[PDB]
Design a protein around this motif. Structure first.
Motif, PDB file in Angstrom:
ATOM      1  N   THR A   8     -21.606   7.575  -1.733  1.00 33.58           N
ATOM      2  CA  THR A   8     -20.681   6.350  -1.698  1.00 33.58           C
ATOM      3  C   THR A   8     -19.513   6.346  -0.338  1.00 33.58           C
ATOM      4  OG1 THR A   8     -19.034   7.076  -3.521  1.00 33.58           O
ATOM      5  CG2 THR A   8     -20.923   5.493  -4.177  1.00 33.58           C
ATOM      6  N   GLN A   9     -20.025   7.290   0.363  1.00 30.96           N
ATOM      7  CA  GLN A   9     -19.108   7.718   1.775  1.00 30.96           C
ATOM      8  C   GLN A   9     -19.166   6.137   2.549  1.00 30.96           C
ATOM      9  OE1 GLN A   9     -18.721  11.751   3.440  1.00 30.96           O
ATOM     10  NE2 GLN A   9     -20.498  11.631   2.268  1.00 30.96           N
ATOM     11  N   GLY A  10     -18.187   5.848   3.198  1.00 31.25           N
ATOM     12  CA  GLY A  10     -17.936   4.644   4.070  1.00 31.25           C
ATOM     13  C   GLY A  10     -16.753   4.631   4.992  1.00 31.25           C
ATOM     14  N   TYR A  11     -16.327   3.411   5.198  1.00 36.27           N
ATOM     15  CA  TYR A  11     -15.152   3.192   5.879  1.00 36.27           C
ATOM     16  C   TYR A  11     -14.279   2.049   5.324  1.00 36.27           C
ATOM     17  CZ  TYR A  11     -17.288   6.041   9.907  1.00 36.27           C
ATOM     18  OH  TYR A  11     -17.797   7.088  10.423  1.00 36.27           O
ATOM     19  N   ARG A  12     -13.191   2.102   5.580  1.00 38.35           N
ATOM     20  CA  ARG A  12     -12.289   1.342   5.231  1.00 38.35           C
ATOM     21  C   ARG A  12     -11.337   0.735   6.260  1.00 38.35           C
ATOM     22  NH1 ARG A  12     -10.231   2.027   0.614  1.00 38.35           N
ATOM     23  NH2 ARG A  12     -10.663   4.216   0.188  1.00 38.35           N
ATOM     24  N   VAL A  13     -10.663  -0.195   6.311  1.00 33.82           N
ATOM     25  CA  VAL A  13     -10.223  -0.883   7.536  1.00 33.82           C
ATOM     26  C   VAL A  13      -8.625  -1.419   6.816  1.00 33.82           C
ATOM     27  CG1 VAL A  13     -11.074  -3.267   7.018  1.00 33.82           C
ATOM     28  CG2 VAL A  13     -10.106  -2.734   9.130  1.00 33.82           C
ATOM     29  N   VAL A  14      -7.595  -0.673   7.419  1.00 37.07           N
ATOM     30  CA  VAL A  14      -6.180  -1.049   7.556  1.00 37.07           C
ATOM     31  C   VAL A  14      -6.235  -2.167   8.521  1.00 37.07           C
ATOM     32  CG1 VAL A  14      -3.818  -0.523   7.692  1.00 37.07           C
ATOM     33  CG2 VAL A  14      -5.735   1.247   6.480  1.00 37.07           C
ATOM     34  N   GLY A  15      -5.517  -3.311   8.212  1.00 41.37           N
ATOM     35  CA  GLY A  15      -5.322  -4.587   9.143  1.00 41.37           C
ATOM     36  C   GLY A  15      -4.115  -4.378  10.001  1.00 41.37           C
ATOM     37  N   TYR A  16      -3.874  -5.261  10.581  1.00 40.83           N
ATOM     38  CA  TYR A  16      -2.482  -5.283  11.324  1.00 40.83           C
ATOM     39  C   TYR A  16      -1.380  -5.383  10.280  1.00 40.83           C
ATOM     40  CZ  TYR A  16      -4.339  -6.587  15.868  1.00 40.83           C
ATOM     41  OH  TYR A  16      -4.935  -6.814  17.061  1.00 40.83           O
ATOM     42  N   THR A  17      -0.285  -4.741  10.624  1.00 40.98           N
ATOM     43  CA  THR A  17       1.068  -4.974   9.890  1.00 40.98           C
ATOM     44  C   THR A  17       1.943  -5.945  10.596  1.00 40.98           C
ATOM     45  OG1 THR A  17       0.896  -2.598   9.245  1.00 40.98           O
ATOM     46  CG2 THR A  17       2.720  -3.460   8.826  1.00 40.98           C
ATOM     47  N   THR A  18       2.244  -7.114   9.896  1.00 41.27           N
ATOM     48  CA  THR A  18       3.225  -7.769  10.564  1.00 41.27           C
ATOM     49  C   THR A  18       4.469  -7.828   9.724  1.00 41.27           C
ATOM     50  OG1 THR A  18       2.179  -9.817   9.645  1.00 41.27           O
ATOM     51  CG2 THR A  18       1.601  -9.048  11.665  1.00 41.27           C
ATOM     52  N   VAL A  19       5.492  -8.252  10.273  1.00 38.89           N
ATOM     53  CA  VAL A  19       6.732  -8.397   9.671  1.00 38.89           C
ATOM     54  C   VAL A  19       7.607  -9.694   9.959  1.00 38.89           C
ATOM     55  CG1 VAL A  19       9.224  -7.286   9.655  1.00 38.89           C
ATOM     56  CG2 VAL A  19       7.232  -5.797   9.988  1.00 38.89           C
ATOM     57  N   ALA A  20       8.039 -10.298   8.894  1.00 42.50           N
ATOM     58  CA  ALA A  20       8.621 -11.674   8.713  1.00 42.50           C
ATOM     59  C   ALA A  20      10.096 -11.322   8.530  1.00 42.50           C
ATOM     60  CB  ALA A  20       8.247 -12.519   8.096  1.00 42.50           C
ATOM     61  N   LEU A  35       6.292 -13.811  13.348  1.00 43.65           N
ATOM     62  CA  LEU A  35       5.879 -12.566  12.919  1.00 43.65           C
ATOM     63  C   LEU A  35       5.989 -11.519  13.990  1.00 43.65           C
ATOM     64  CD1 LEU A  35       2.519 -13.151  10.883  1.00 43.65           C
ATOM     65  CD2 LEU A  35       4.699 -12.578   9.663  1.00 43.65           C
ATOM     66  N   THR A  36       6.698 -10.528  13.658  1.00 40.91           N
ATOM     67  CA  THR A  36       6.349  -9.305  14.605  1.00 40.91           C
ATOM     68  C   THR A  36       5.317  -8.386  14.231  1.00 40.91           C
ATOM     69  OG1 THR A  36       9.016  -9.414  14.765  1.00 40.91           O
ATOM     70  CG2 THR A  36       8.154  -7.495  15.610  1.00 40.91           C
ATOM     71  N   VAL A  37       4.735  -7.916  15.202  1.00 44.04           N
ATOM     72  CA  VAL A  37       3.620  -6.958  14.925  1.00 44.04           C
ATOM     73  C   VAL A  37       4.250  -5.535  15.024  1.00 44.04           C
ATOM     74  CG1 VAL A  37       1.309  -6.204  15.527  1.00 44.04           C
ATOM     75  CG2 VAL A  37       2.137  -8.716  16.163  1.00 44.04           C
ATOM     76  N   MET A  38       4.063  -5.011  13.895  1.00 43.26           N
ATOM     77  CA  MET A  38       4.581  -3.519  13.598  1.00 43.26           C
ATOM     78  C   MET A  38       3.690  -2.555  13.743  1.00 43.26           C
ATOM     79  SD  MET A  38       6.906  -1.353  12.213  1.00 43.26           S
ATOM     80  CE  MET A  38       5.833  -0.592  10.686  1.00 43.26           C
ATOM     81  N   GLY A  39       2.346  -2.902  13.436  1.00 42.71           N
ATOM     82  CA  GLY A  39       1.258  -1.815  13.364  1.00 42.71           C
ATOM     83  C   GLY A  39       0.102  -2.610  13.750  1.00 42.71           C
ATOM     84  N   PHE A  96       8.439  -6.569   0.196  1.00 41.86           N
ATOM     85  CA  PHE A  96       9.790  -6.835   0.185  1.00 41.86           C
ATOM     86  C   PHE A  96      10.878  -5.753   0.563  1.00 41.86           C
ATOM     87  CE2 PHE A  96      13.928  -7.091  -2.026  1.00 41.86           C
ATOM     88  CZ  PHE A  96      14.475  -8.133  -1.519  1.00 41.86           C
ATOM     89  N   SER A  97      11.738  -6.083   1.416  1.00 41.99           N
ATOM     90  CA  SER A  97      12.947  -5.409   1.485  1.00 41.99           C
ATOM     91  C   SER A  97      13.887  -6.135   1.872  1.00 41.99           C
ATOM     92  CB  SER A  97      12.741  -4.235   2.532  1.00 41.99           C
ATOM     93  OG  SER A  97      12.891  -4.626   3.704  1.00 41.99           O
ATOM     94  N   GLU A  98      15.330  -5.769   1.973  1.00 48.96           N
ATOM     95  CA  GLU A  98      16.564  -6.737   2.304  1.00 48.96           C
ATOM     96  C   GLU A  98      16.470  -6.935   3.915  1.00 48.96           C
ATOM     97  OE1 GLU A  98      19.505  -8.021   0.614  1.00 48.96           O
ATOM     98  OE2 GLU A  98      17.756  -7.629  -1.140  1.00 48.96           O
ATOM     99  N   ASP A  99      15.936  -6.162   4.484  1.00 47.10           N
ATOM    100  CA  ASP A  99      15.938  -6.428   6.306  1.00 47.10           C
ATOM    101  C   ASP A  99      14.623  -7.243   6.458  1.00 47.10           C
ATOM    102  OD1 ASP A  99      17.424  -4.283   6.017  1.00 47.10           O
ATOM    103  OD2 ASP A  99      16.899  -3.498   7.979  1.00 47.10           O
ATOM    104  N   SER A 100      13.553  -7.154   5.918  1.00 46.95           N
ATOM    105  CA  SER A 100      12.208  -7.993   6.151  1.00 46.95           C
ATOM    106  C   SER A 100      11.118  -8.134   5.110  1.00 46.95           C
ATOM    107  CB  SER A 100      11.758  -7.424   7.373  1.00 46.95           C
ATOM    108  OG  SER A 100      11.228  -6.029   7.341  1.00 46.95           O
ATOM    109  N   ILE A 101      10.098  -8.756   5.470  1.00 47.99           N
ATOM    110  CA  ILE A 101       8.794  -8.854   4.640  1.00 47.99           C
ATOM    111  C   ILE A 101       7.784  -8.258   5.595  1.00 47.99           C
ATOM    112  CG2 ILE A 101       7.334 -10.134   3.533  1.00 47.99           C
ATOM    113  CD1 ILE A 101       9.991 -12.093   2.860  1.00 47.99           C
ATOM    114  N   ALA A 102       7.133  -6.919   5.088  1.00 51.47           N
ATOM    115  CA  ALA A 102       5.873  -6.422   5.906  1.00 51.47           C
ATOM    116  C   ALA A 102       4.621  -6.885   4.921  1.00 51.47           C
ATOM    117  CB  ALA A 102       6.114  -5.054   5.872  1.00 51.47           C
TER     118      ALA A 102
END
Length: 177
Positions: free
Chosen positions: A54-66, A38-42, A117-123
């Motif tokens: 209902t206010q709070g926090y959300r977590v976006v994780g690592y973005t990796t690319v195969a 995997l490549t670490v994209m983000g 999915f994309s033709e280049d890679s999978i994020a």
């Protein structure tokens, strides 16, 4: 419809500590099935969510690319390798404007993990449901986030040349250590 309601969800800090590394693990088979890495994209980050009490926090994780694989083969993989915490597997009905097609893995909180999915890679990207906390709102940067060591326990960080030999080389993850 029957997602765990907001108040009864674990805190943002508990989620970062205990769920995020589990969530991040589901990318590994995608790199394994390729026969590679995997490549670490983000990098992961936190952002505000919810409204009113209902206010709070959300977590976006690592973005990796195969590297890429046929969409049919990805759906097979994602479905056959489905984790227990995933209440449903959603498959995009069509490829969008960007030539990308998504498969989503929905958790019992209404949170999300997406294989693009994309033709280049999978994020592989994660985006939790909105989570409560006893900490101040409107300050998403207060929360420490796990190192890539901690997010991907069975893996270790290496560095590869950028596929296009321009700009910095990129950080990669490979199994072991």
């Amino acid at each position: 419809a029957e997602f765990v309601p907001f108040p009864e969800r674990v805190s943002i800090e508990e989620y970062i500590s205990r769920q995020l590394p589990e969530i991040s693990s589901v990318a590994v088979p995608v790199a394994a099935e390729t026969g590679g890495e995997l490549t670490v994209m983000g990098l992961p980050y936190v952002q505000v969510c919810g409204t009113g009490d209902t206010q709070g926090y959300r977590v976006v994780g690592y973005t990796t690319v195969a590297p890429s694989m046929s969409f049919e083969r990805l759906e097979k993989l994602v479905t056959e390798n489905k984790p227990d915490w995933a209440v449903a597997v959603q498959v995009d009905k069509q490829i969008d404007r960007d030539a990308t097609r998504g498969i989503q893995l929905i958790d019992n909180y209404g949170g999300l993990v997406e294989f693009k999915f994309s033709e280049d890679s999978i994020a592989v990207r994660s985006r939790s449901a909105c989570l409560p906390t006893n900490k101040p709102l409107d300050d998403p940067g207060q929360f420490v986030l796990p190192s890539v060591e901690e997010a991907f326990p069975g893996m270790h960080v290496t560095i590869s040349d950028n596929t296009n030999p321009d700009l910095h080389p990129v950080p990669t993850l490979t199994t072991g250590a």
